[PDB]
Amino acid sequence: AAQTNAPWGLARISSTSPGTSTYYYDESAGQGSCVYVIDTGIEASHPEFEGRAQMVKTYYYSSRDGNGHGTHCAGTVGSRTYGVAKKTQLFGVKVLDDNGSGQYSTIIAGMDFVASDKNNRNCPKGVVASLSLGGGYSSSVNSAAARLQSSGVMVAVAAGNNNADARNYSPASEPSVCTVGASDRYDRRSSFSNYGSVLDIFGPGTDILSTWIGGSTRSISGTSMATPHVAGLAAYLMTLGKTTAASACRYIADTANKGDLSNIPFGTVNLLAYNNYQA
Amino acid sequence: AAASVK
Ligand SMILES: [Ca+2]
């Protein structure tokens, strides 16, 4: 299939070269896979989700997204127009308040929640979780993400936006999860993207158009934007049977476009996620 | 004790 005039990041993860505007993808489009978005929530009523989204857990007085951050991330995974896996089922988990902040204890509670809740859902093709959040290093936070991965959920985490080595941030620094940096439309490491040996892969992160609250759209930038590109890709590749939740990050990294990025410091992978579709 | 959006 082909989506003309798509957001540049969708075109890029289906291109061996930059400067294209069409999104080429298999029509299965992640059907039968489930992606948990752990963030400020999801405005499920948005027309772009087509009823495939719902809020399953909150740790605050409200389960609505009052901030917009989570709705945008969910849009990049699975919105009808802006999403990688246009037929996936999305489940929201509000671990951050509408200011965008949260406590590490509530972050941990949300990861252990998904490890249990997935057993109450029909995800015959696999389960992914997207974590476009982070903070300072904490073993406990890392341990929570590692537990989630081991249970059989592909965990993708944003590397961070401090133009520093991600080893001093959590859960980015956890070796067992997939740690995603950001690139821009000219195949450069985004200026703000963290780096380091703990990074697994890069995805589109600068000026990413996606869903927002109030039934709207907007473009924003960060490693938070690259992570759902990778989260959706994993859901798409599992439906196709190409990999498993356990071995997906390694599979994306091996099949990636290798050697196309600039502004990559020595000691960081030069891998840009690629969906390897050949119509 | 706090994490943030990125
Ligand atoms: Ca890994």
* From A40, A104, A161, residue closest to B6, measured CB to CB: A161
* From A100, A105, A223, residue closest to B4, measured CB to CB: A100
Looking at beta carbons, which residues of chain A come within 8 Å of B6?
132-134, 158, 160-161, 222-224
Looking at beta carbons, which residues of chain A come within 8 Å of B1?
103-105
DSSP assignment string, A7-19: -HHHHHTT-SSSS
Contact A222 B3 (CB under 8 A): no
Q: Residue A111 in contact with residue A21, Cβ under 8 Å?
A: no
Angle at CA of residue A84, ends A57 and A43, nearest 5°: 35
Q: Residue A113 in contact with residue A131, Cβ under 8 Å?
A: no
Residue A253 CB partners (closer than 8 Å, separation 6+): A200, A201, A269, A271
Q: Residue A79 in contact with residue A87, Cβ under 8 Å?
A: no
Taking each helix axis from N to C end, the angle separating A139-150 and A104-117, rounded to the nearest 10 degrees, works out to 10
Would you call A224 a catalytic residue per the annotation? yes
Nominal resolution in Å? 1.5
Q: Which helix (H) or strand (E) holds A94?
A: strand A89-94
A175 is known to lie in a ligand binding site = yes
Count H helices, E strands: chain A? Answer: 6, 16
Q: How were these coordinates obtained?
A: X-ray
Residue A255: CB atoms within 10 Å: 17
Helices (H), chain A: 8-12, 69-78, 104-117, 139-150, 223-239, 248-254
Q: Residue A181 in contact with residue A194, Cβ under 8 Å?
A: yes
A26 is known to lie in a ligand binding site = no
Alpha-carbon gap: A266 to the closest alpha carbon of chain B (Å) = 24
Nearest residue to A127 (alpha-carbon basis) of A48, A239, A14: A239
Angle at CA of residue A252, ends A246 and A258, nearest 5°: 150
Give the span between the Cα atoms of A277 and A39, in whole angstroms. Answer: 30
- The catalytically annotated residue of A184, A190, A224, A229 is A224
Would you call A26 a catalytic residue per the annotation? no
Contact A107 B3 (CB under 8 A): yes
The phi, psi pair for A117, rounded to 5°, reads -65, -30
Both tokens of A149, joined, read 């991965």
Q: Residue A21 in contact with residue A4, Cβ under 8 Å?
A: yes
CA nearest to B3 within chain A? A135
Q: How close is the Cα of A176 to the center of ligand 1, in Å?
A: 5
CA nearest to A222 within chain B? B6
Q: In the CATH scheme, what is the homologous superfamily, with its name and number, of domain A1-279?
A: Peptidase S8/S53 domain (3.40.50.200)
Q: Which residues of A60-80 are buried (b: 16+ CB within 10 A; e: fewer)?
A: beebbbbbbbbbbbbbbbbbb
**A126-131 vs A153-158, strand pairing mode:** parallel
